[PDB]
Design a protein around this ligand. Structure first.
Ligand SMILES: CCn1c(-c2nonc2N)nc2cnc(C)cc21
Lengths: 19, 337
């Protein structure tokens, strides 16, 4: 599922602004 | 009318924008409680102002680190804009000052925490719940954009939930007052509009693209473009493709196709009718814009209130000292702060 793919991803925590 | 309200708001803003408040408190007036958050910008600390007993969120930036990160102009923008704005859905800047080492912005504290934590934990918000929050961002961008301000970092991490369940936008680290186009590559990967990724001159339409990303993430529980690395996210954004969960209403999908629109001559918020294309959309038919502004609408969620200084809604961070050198650092760079 898309949800399972998101939860297994490395970007579920707080996201930093770019540099 | 909306034109009349915004005209008075501009007159108020310009007086403060042209003559900014400076040096309105000192570090010794606050008791350090706990770190609320950290990032490349520095940290945000929960503090208590002894003379009032009020709690505040003190954003602390290290001047030397700001210089290394090439964020001098951006930090001056953040403070100059925050001290000048006034809107129900914007976090208030209560005081600001600097010392030999650091810059301090003392903000209104929201113990309710970031929308981010609630959204991740609950998983997703129903459409009426997501709409309630979306309406506050639409009004906030209508206000900011009328002052020639571009926000540039919309995301659930930057939306605080107050004691009444309403939103307060925080973090003006990339906000800028610009009448023309601008070019800085800044923002958060998942929320970048294609014109930013493609190194084009861009305008306030990037905030409306970011609103599409936010509404999608609130209603789906995950963003429209995600991957393990930013490069893979950028490839998805620029592809011109987007997939919606089957539970999304027809009205919600129609609004999102118009906000997540690569074509600038077609993106809602960027047309002749401006923000009214969004306000008048079918998805917002039940939204009473004035009742939202006046905070008369019952909020769908009220964070558990455990006291004015409680931090249960925030993660824990390693506590570091607040060091103040005996020598002034970067005096010229931050002279106007
Ligand atoms: C820790 C979350 N946070 C807050 C607040 N956290 O609690 N009340 C706040 N206000 N204000 C911020 C400004 N800039 C930043 C990067 C983060 C901020």
């Amino acid at each position: 599922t898309t949800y399972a793919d998101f939860i297994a991803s490395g970007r579920t925590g707080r996201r930093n602004a770019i540099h | 009318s909306v034109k009349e309200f915004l005209a008075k708001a501009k007159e108020d803003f310009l007086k403060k924008w042209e003559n900014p408040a400076q040096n309105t408190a000192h570090l010794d007036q606050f008791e350090r409680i706990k770190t609320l958050g950290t990032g490349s910008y520095g940290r945000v600390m929960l503090v208590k102002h002894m003379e009032t007993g009020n709690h505040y969120a003190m954003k602390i930036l290290d001047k030397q680190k700001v210089v290394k990160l090439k964020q001098i102009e951006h930090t001056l923008n953040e403070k100059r804009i925050l001290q000048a704005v006034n809107f129900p859905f914007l976090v208030k800047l209560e005081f600001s000052f600097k010392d030999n080492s650091n810059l301090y912005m003392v903000l209104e504290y929201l113990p309710g925490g970031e929308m981010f934590s609630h959204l991740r934990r609950i998983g997703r918000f129903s459409e009426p719940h997501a709409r309630f929050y979306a309406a506050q961002i639409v009004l906030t961008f209508e206000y900011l954009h009328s002052l020639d301000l571009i926000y540039r970092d919309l995301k659930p991490e930057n939306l605080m939930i107050d004691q009444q369940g309403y939103i307060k936008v925080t973090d003006f680290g990339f906000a800028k007052r610009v009448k023309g186009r601008t070019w800085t590559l800044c923002g958060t990967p998942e929320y970048l509009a294609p014109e930013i990724i493609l190194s084009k001159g861009y305008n306030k339409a990037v905030d409306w693209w970011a609103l599409g990303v936010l509404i999608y993430e609130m209603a789906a529980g995950y963003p429209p473009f995600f991957a393990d690395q930013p490069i893979q996210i950028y490839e998805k954004i620029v592809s011109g493709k987007v997939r919606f969960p089957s539970h999304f209403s027809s009205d919600l999908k129609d609004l999102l196709r118009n906000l997540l629109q690569v074509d600038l001559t077609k993106r809602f918020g960027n047309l002749k009718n401006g923000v009214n294309d969004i306000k008048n959309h079918k998805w917002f038919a039940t939204t009473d814009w004035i009742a939202i502004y006046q905070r008369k609408v019952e909020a769908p969620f009220i964070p558990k209130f455990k006291g004015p200084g409680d931090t249960s809604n925030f993660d824990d961070y390693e506590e570091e000292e607040i060091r103040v050198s005996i020598n002034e650092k970067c005096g010229k760079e931050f002279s106007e702060f």
